[PDB]
């Protein structure tokens, strides 16, 4: 049985710009027992029927995780626009996997969480950018932040206790499935 508890029930989660990857391998994955957490505000899948997940096998499964805002969870999906999906975490158009999200104001309100506002270009799918070099609007990067037109590219989220649910922290975990010409490492109950 796959260690889904250690991903979803983890005490700490990454900033979306510094999203973490965990590898699920050599285990049986009953996704329907993962569902039963009614805390899930979001549970959508792409390229696979969620009923049919119990009978599929994959060569490699990854579990990426991050903290974004309620009104940004919609951006964690294929072929989407936004500051998160273009500078923090991008998904391929042919994405095969699932996106799960839940409200985490209980654990992440008053938490040091960041996202990337400025970038020279959009992320390639599954790219990660941990750079903290100053961004020059019209200027060259690496300029002095005290000067004008020069900003730090990473901004804190500010998950105050009075904001609307659209602004509160939500923890997202993205399971991505792939099966190539390689042996299987993850299988459902029906196809063990």
């Amino acid at each position: 049985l796959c260690p889904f508890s250690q991903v979803f029930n983890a005490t700490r989660f990454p900033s979306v710009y510094a999203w973490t990857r965990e590898r699920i391998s050599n285990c049986i994955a009953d996704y329907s027992v993962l569902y039963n957490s009614t805390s899930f505000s979001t549970f959508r899948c792409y390229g696979v029927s969620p009923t049919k997940l119990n009978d599929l096998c994959f060569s490699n499964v990854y579990a990426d995780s991050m903290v974004v805002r309620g009104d940004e969870v919609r951006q964690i999906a294929p072929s989407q626009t936004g500051v998160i999906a273009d500078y923090n975490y991008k998904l391929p158009d042919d994405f095969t996997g699932c996106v799960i999200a839940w409200n985490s104001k209980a654990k992440d309100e008053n938490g040091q969480y960041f996202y990337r506002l400025f970038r020279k270009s959009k992320l390639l799918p599954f790219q990660r950018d941990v750079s903290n070099v100053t961004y020059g609007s019209g200027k060259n990067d690496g300029c002095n932040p005290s000067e004008a037109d020069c900003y730090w590219p990473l901004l804190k989220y500010g998950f105050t206790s009075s904001v609307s649910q659209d602004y509160q922290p939500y923890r997202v975990v993205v399971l991505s499935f792939e099966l190539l010409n390689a042996p299987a490492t993850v299988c459902g109950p029906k196809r063990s």
Partner: nanobody
Amino acid sequence: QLQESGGGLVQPGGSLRLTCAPSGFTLDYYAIGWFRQAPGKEREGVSCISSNNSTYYADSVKGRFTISRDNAKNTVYLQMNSLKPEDTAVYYCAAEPDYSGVYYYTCGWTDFGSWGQGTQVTVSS
């Protein structure tokens, strides 16, 4: 932008048809959901349909509510039949781009960025 019509006052067991109407875009490559918000309580997802024509329904409405898209008439209607008092709330429709097909295990407000203003639905006698 989404325009919503069809709500109103209905006796227990009656019928209602909620309409959701897009302006300025086509619902062909979009996913549309119907959401209700009772007084105080949080926006619950009632029924959603993706471009896949794959659908979701809340467990409490499963046998009684029906979502449908008219990709030619650019309308998405929720048929609300066998109405219960528990069904009284403000109903919003929502729309999200869905260029690749979505499959919902659940449907939530966290899944849509465009919303309507709401229609009031009341089931009483």
